Structure formats: C-alpha cells, structure tokens
Amino acid sequence: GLIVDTRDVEERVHVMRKTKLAPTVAHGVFNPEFGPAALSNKDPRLNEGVVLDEVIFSKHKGDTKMSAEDKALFRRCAADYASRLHSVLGTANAPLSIYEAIKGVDGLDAMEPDTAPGLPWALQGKRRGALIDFENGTVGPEVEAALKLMEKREYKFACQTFLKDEIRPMEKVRAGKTRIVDVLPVEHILYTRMMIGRFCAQMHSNNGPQIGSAVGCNPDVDWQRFGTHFAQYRNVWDVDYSAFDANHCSDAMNIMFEEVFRTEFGFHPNAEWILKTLVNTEHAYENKRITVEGGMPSGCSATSIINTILNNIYVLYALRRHYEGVELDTYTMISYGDDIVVASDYDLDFEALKPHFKSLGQTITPADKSDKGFVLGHSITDVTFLKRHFHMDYGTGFYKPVMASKTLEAILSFARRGTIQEKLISVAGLAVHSGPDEYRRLFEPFQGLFEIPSYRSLYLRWVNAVCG
Amino acid sequence: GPVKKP
C-alpha cells in the first residue's frame, strides 16, 4: 500500500524481539542455506546498516490508481467470477451466529482460544480467553460493545504488527527481509466470520479448479484430483507475484468486495462494510503508528480466501485487458493466496500480460525465474504449488505432493524447544512422498534420538487416504 | 486459431 502518514506516540507496543527456532541435530548435517528470520535490530547475521524497520515496510511502495475504463473492466471480471463462485456455492450467506462464528461449522475451523488478541487488548495484558468464552461460544461486554459499534458501522481499530518468526533463505535473513503478521483485534475476526463465515465454509468444502481455489484442500488426498485435471491441458504456467498482498490496490479491493459480497447473493449488508475496513488501516509497531492506504493485512480471518478471489479476478482481467473473447472457460486455474497454477489449451502469452497485471499494481514473473520469462508447453509435472510438485506414484498410479529435499532439510534443521518429536512426525508426512531412500537420508540425523515413523507405515496410510 | 487481439 501507500504509506500516507507516520507518527510516534508514548504508548509502546512491544513488537517481536526474540527467536523461537532452535537449531536441531540436523542443522550440522545438512548445513542449510536457511535460518531464522532476524527478530531484533541487534542481530549479528544481518548486513551492516540493514535496518529491518525500514526493510520490513519497504513493501509499501504505493496504491495503484486505476482508470475508469480499467475499473469498469475489473468490475465485469469481478462480477463474472462472483457469478461462477455463487453458482457453485449457493447463496445461503446469512450471518453465522456468535456461537457458530466462534465454534466453527462444517468446513470452518473454530477460532483459536489462545492466539494473540490484537489491539487495544494487547496493551491491557488481556488474553483472548478473557474476552470470549471459546467453550460456550459467548462474548463478554467488551466484545459485545465492539460488535454493536460494528453493527452501526462505527467501529475503528489498529493492526498490531508482529515480526514473523520463521525459517527463511539466509539471503533474505541477511537483507532483513523479515515478514510481518498484521494481527487484527479478535472481535474484528469474529464479526468477519459472522458476516462471511458460511461463504468461507462453502469455499473450503468446494475447493478445486471450478472455483479457482485450493483453500481448505488436503494435498495428500487432493493432489490426485488437481493433477489429473491440469494434466489434460496443453499449457500450464506457475506464476510468481512480488508482494501480492501489499500491492492489492484500493480500487481493486473495493470493487471486488462490492461485486462478490452483494446482498443479492445472501450476505448481510455489513459483509461488504467489514471487508472494506481492510483497505485503509493503521499499524502499530513499538512507538510508531503507520497509516496505509491499499493492500491486504495478513491477519483478517479471510485473508487467504480474499487473496485467492483477487488472484482469480486478476487473471481474468489481465487476459481480457489483452485479448478479445476471453471467458472463464478460456483457461483453468487454482490459487491459494498468491500461489497459482493456470492452464489452457490456448497459447496464451503471459509475457505480454505483464503490463496488464502492472495496471493492477502487480508484477508477475515465471516461478522458474527463467531468463526468457514465460514459455509454452510446461506441464503439471513442471510446476510448484504450495511448495509441492505433482509426481506420479507408481505403486498406486496416483499423483503425490513432493517437496524439495533442500526445503525439507531446512524444515528439519530448526525447531522450537520441546517440539522436535512432534515436528518430526509432522514432517514425516511431507517427506514420505520423496521416496524411501530420501526419507531415510532426511531422518538419519535423528536415529536413536527420536521416534521416526517407518516409511512403510506412512506409505500404507497415504494409500488408504488417497483411495479409501 | 487462438483468441483475438483488440
């Protein structure tokens, strides 16, 4: 987005200044070009002069203003995609009750009881369980008062900026390219789930190419479904965006909310409103208060779904900004936030599409970082999606999600204290698809030290999962 | 053939 104002205040919001990823026994074996992101300005690994405070907000390079004709085109694309979405999902989009928004419904996980509560609560030393009854699905007076302000369209909030404690390529770490999480107030998440939670549940339950969304998928089971679909198209592309969430422009976010979340599709009128509160935001980082126009905060309850919807509309808009006769059947795609696979039997020129995405504020490049840029003839076995390749398994004849061994090494090389055993079981479920030899190599630093699931047990499990 | 240019 466009930073329109920066100011200092006495109230100090203590941002992330720690590192909860300890190196494991595996670090010394694999020596990964990956490490924890820098969480303190006094981190020796960063380059001299690197000031994360500057770097971490450099993503806010502006808010692209769109022309009348381009906005009218975007509106048509948003309405055409919305028509497709709602035809699949239905229009039972009435608000969830407070209980259902807290506890979840089929296709929507319950709210987290002990994650960050956001502002102003973070100042007051209050936890989420002190504001909401996650067992009974009720709210206290504080939240109830805010919900009434939201009903009245009178609610205002600040985003709380957290630095993301995660493993990153050591190059990004050296450059201070630490990611931020914008933690919204828990009552804003709550009301958003009230306004659009049934829609989100339906999105999850209907994930697939038809709606262009993989949010809610299970890669172990669904890679077969997605792979067989994309295998039958002549051209497949995997596209990278630069700072996709920060570069969603005000015009595009407002129009998308207006066309997707209409009352004529069953939504309460405040569905559009609460989503629109995401466009112009205020972010709290220590004594800094930074006001931004445009861009999506990461901590909306529906950030992934909203990013996915925008991705779908961006592709239709860009193709239509360059070709005549483009329709939702001219191509197929599936997206997860900024992640995207597009396919088509037409020789679409993604190189030529670069300026049309730029008119939206977005910069697309091939995911292969090729020097020629986009090309034709790539297949589903060439692309990466959710960090996973699409590989045929020969015992079953089914597609399986295969992660890069370098990435698995990095994941296994760090862990927070007292979770190594738990993490190994988790990562084992990702690594089984790399085959027995690599699976063995990946886990050999932990032999005699922790329980390692047998390759056989996880393969037999996966087989029943993908067919049974 | 493929789609059209405007």
Author numbering:
A (entry chain A): 1 to 468
B (entry chain B): 4 to 9
Any passages from the paper?
The core enzyme in the replication machinery is the viral RNA-dependent RNA polymerase (RdRP) 3Dpol. The enzyme adopts the canonical closed right-hand polymerase fold, consisting of fingers, palm, and thumb subdomains that encircles seven conserved structural motifs (A to G), playing critical roles in rNTP substrate recognition, template/primer binding and catalysis. 3Dpol uses 3B as a primer protein to initiate the replication process. Unlike other picornaviruses, the animal pathogen foot-and-mouth disease virus (FMDV), encodes three non-identical copies of the 3B (3B1, 3B2, and 3B3) that could be specialized in different functions within the replication complex.
Different crystals were of complexes: 3DpolHis-3B1, 3DpolHis-3B3 or 3DpolStop-3B1, 3DpolStop-3B3 that belonged to the space group P3221. While in orthorhombic crystals the bound 3B1 peptide connected the two 3Dpol molecules of the asymmetric unit, in the P3221 space group, the proximity of a neighbour 3Dpol molecule in the crystal packing prevented the correct binding of the whole 3B peptide, and only a few residues could be positioned in the electron density maps. In these crystals, the position of the visible 3B1 fragment is almost coincident with that of 3B3 (from G5 to P10), therefore, the final structural analysis was carried out only with the 3DpolStop-3B3 complex structure that diffracted at the highest resolution (1.85 Å). As expected, the visible part of the FMDV 3B3 peptide in the trigonal crystals bound to the same 3Dpol cavity at the base palm, close to residues from Y323 to V326 and from Y346 to L348. This binding cavity was also equivalent to the so-called “contact II region” in enterovirus 71 (EV71) 3Dpol, involving residues: from T313 to I317 and from Y335 to P338 that anchor the second half of the EV71 3B peptide, amino acids from L11 to R17. The proximity of a neighbouring 3Dpol molecule (Grey) in the crystal packing probably limits the 3B molecule from being arranged in an ordered way. Also, L19 is replaced by N in 3B3, hindering the placement of this residue in the hydrophobic pocket. In light of these data we suggest that 3B2 and 3B3 could bind 3Dpol through region I which has a lower affinity.
